[PDB]
Amino acid sequence: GTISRPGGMRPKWHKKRIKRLKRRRRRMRQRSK
């Protein structure tokens, strides 16, 4: 332990998830227009 009560995952992994979500969304939308 080295940080205080961040609760809601590790703040690094939770960034990563939002990235591979955003990539996905872009890929969809681009074709759909």
Place this chain on the structure above:
RNA sequence: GAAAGUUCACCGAUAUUUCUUCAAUAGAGGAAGCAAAAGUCGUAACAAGGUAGCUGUAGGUGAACCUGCAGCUGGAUCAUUU
């Protein structure tokens, strides 16, 4: 002198069409967020939390996450060849 009417130019309602632009709206299907707290699968985090922890980046994975490379101490070290 002077009416109806003629012809040309100008101003131009209105309609139509083109371009431009703003506002608002139906919707198959797809994807997130939050609030409820006695559902389900695990145990990642807080003690060296039982693979120290965290940051940046890439890859992998049912999920929390895991693994490589380079950093920080907000460590578990303020410190051992005169």
